Symmetry: C4
Subunit: 219 residues, 4 copies
């Protein structure tokens, strides 16, 4: 009746990929998400998808807090929703990647959260918790652990520049990044430095991936 996430949806007997209502502990109004019911037995709540460059990801603080795009296509679920999900239980993160040569890879993180113990996660900049990498894509996220989220209009990074403005995205920037999955949809190899859909451990700092999906499941 009130699944808290896509794993509750799966265990209630819904086996199809698609859009479902979930109701996190501290977000009782609930909201709709895309559930991946296939990957590693299923029950994954999607919070980011790139697939075709139809949606603008070069967005400000309010858009990254509140979410944008469509659940059936390219979207960012919103940091307020990702906080409501990742604080209610211990989640793992799955990242699926595809290049423009139909190569695929994945990274799995045994631990993932945003603003986990922040009294005001927005004020506190939704800081990243991430640990325990496995998979085929290589690790491009551990270096970001403990970093606040930065947008073009709200700088909490460890550059004297704004990493989000400079690398044309929004991420838990350090000085500045090994991943940038919210970067410009530049479609494969590019001359500009690290400002595309980058997962550096797989395809370097000058290759914008075709497809990315970031999704969570209780450990």
């Amino acid at each position: 009746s009130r699944p808290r996430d896509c794993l509750d949806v799966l265990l209630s007997g819904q086996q199809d990929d698609g859009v479902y209502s979930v109701f996190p502990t501290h977000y009782p109004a609930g909201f709709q998400v895309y559930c991946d019911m296939r990957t590693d037995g299923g029950g994954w709540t999607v919070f980011q998808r790139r697939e075709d460059g139809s949606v603008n990801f070069f967005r400000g603080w309010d858009a990254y807090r509140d979410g944008f795009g469509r659940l059936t296509g390219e979207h960012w679920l919103g940091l307020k929703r990702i906080h409501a999900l990742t604080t209610q239980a211990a989640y793992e993160l799955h990242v699926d990647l595809e290049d423009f040569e139909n190569g695929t890879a994945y990274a799995r993180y045994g631990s993932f959260g945003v603003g986990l113990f922040s009294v005001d996660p927005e004020e506190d900049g939704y800081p990243l918790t991430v640990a325990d990498y496995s998979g085929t894509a290589g690790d491009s996220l551990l270096k970001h652990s403990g970093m606040r989220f930065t947008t073009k209009d709200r700088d909490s990074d460890h550059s004297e520049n704004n990493c989000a403005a400079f690398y044309r995205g929004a991420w838990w920037y350090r000085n500045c990044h090994t991943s940038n999955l919210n970067g410009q949809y530049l479609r494969g190899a590019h001359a500009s430095y690290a400002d595309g859909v980058e997962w550096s451990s797989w395809t370097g700092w000058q290759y914008s991936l075709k497809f990315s999906e970031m999704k969570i499941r209780p450990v």
Copy 2:
């Protein structure tokens, strides 16, 4: 106890037309609506009514998001409420029309929604989903399918002008419209082009209707 819409109110044993409390899945505070318990067996949730020009419909974004007028008279229920209703289940739309010669007609749409898969339906402009026309008024809505909602202060249409400013209303404007039920209450035939309560397939682009009601019921 907690009907999600006017069909739940009807099936609970309330047979009179009137104002009732409903509680959509993702709007658990609930709100009051006018229920039509008569049309095609009843259970219709009203979200728009024109009948006498007593209410100003030439309103900005905030008014069309939040609603205006009175449930017992002319009103717009508000796109945030229409989103909360149409995303909780698959709805049909019924449109009742009356001209100033006591002629009536209706359009039925087997599928209707606003911002159905939008992460932020407001940001995304509450885009229209509508399909499967039947009735006596003719179809004046299918051409609007997939269009964002436009007001005089927020332009998401496919004109290089603001369709809402120009046609003095608020609608899912393309370039620009075949219907304008939120247009000025100009009372029948008028010289100005398409800026009245227009349903073009029935009464052309220069006839402001006396009465309109837009209402929804689960398929």
Copy 3:
């Protein structure tokens, strides 16, 4: 467990006057009110009290929407809360008055509501519904029936002036008033015209009352 008003509190077995939690149908977070468990068998939800001039009632729109003062003393519960109460059921209004000569009187209204059928009661100005007077104070409210609420910063009255600015209060002003229980605490007879705690049918337009209480109970 979840009384909707002070009558539910009374019928649950709480017989003492005081502050209690209530949970209106469309305000499920609930809030605290002062319950009068004595008047005419009890179960009255207080929304206004004057007794000593310790609280400033010459306040703007936001203060009259959101409430001010303290539940144990002078207060205005707030029009958003009075709307949440009066729309969930059919309420009567009781007004208790006291002059500075220890005279008391009361007015009872068989019907009372604010913004009863308004889609956006705030936008719509929380219009007064009131009918069916009885009691000792005389009727000073029926002439206000159907009038929007006016403050010094938001004019919806039927003067070409701002009635709230002019009569130094906040009320459902026509042109302008027969009651002004939110007026200045001027302490009895005064030279200024109708700008005190006025109930004109009892003590005229130049007498500021010592005590007023406005409270509601389901019919």
Copy 4:
């Protein structure tokens, strides 16, 4: 399932100190707090902690309303949350203090609340209710009883200056204080007057304490 505070968490069978979900009567979304399950049998809800000066406490009104820092470290839970907790039942306050010589002391108050009967506790400035001192630190809070909360940008104190600006903190200032646990983390004895983490009855007006924790439990 829905503990209202850390005492409900304890009595449900959770004996470890740590972060838990609580759901106050008028804050039904709930939020996370740090529970002290050890002090005097346990069940204490933490709302303030100083331990190392890593968090800036010289913050404005919005930060003191909404909370800041992290539940596992230095934080202020936020006056809106402290109001939601202290109005749902009768609470006692426990204050644990430590100096830089590993001395500890405590103050216990048999009665504690903020904005207890305020219709709008924010407007009303979250006024302090506190009574019935016992413990080893001495009383440095009773003189503040009945005072509104003051920040550098919102002055409700009884100085003709802003006590919060002057003593570089945020507190229920009179003219001005005997305690300032939200003051600058100045680390022990200091030349500046009363602008550190001060508990005057224990360590005077020129000694910034190493550790403070303010926490509540139903009487």
